[PDB]
Amino acid sequence: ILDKIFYGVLDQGNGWLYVYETPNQDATYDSALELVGQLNKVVDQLFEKASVLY
């Protein structure tokens, strides 16, 4: 499960193995993290411009 080579989770509350083979991670949502990431960096730099006004 640590390799992630078939995914799944192991339940010792009854003794089953659930085998989940469903897709992971939304690609679209994930690339939105790097885009926000870059906007959060830029605004510190815009604030360097605004030191001119002060």
Does residue 9 touch other proteins according to CB under 8 A? no
Selected binder of other proteins within 3, 5, 20, 27 (CB under 8 A): 27
Among 2, 18, 22, 49, interactor with other proteins by CB under 8 A: 49
d(CA 50, CA 39): 17
**Between 1 and 32, CB nearer to other proteins:** 32
Contact flag: residue 31 with other proteins (CB under 8 A): yes
User: Which helix (DSSP H) or strand (DSSP E) does residue 28 occupy?
Assistant: helix 27-49
| Rounded Cα gap, residues 43 and 41, in angstroms | 6
Structure tokens at 52: 């001119």
Asked whether position 45 contacts other proteins by CB under 8 A, the answer is yes
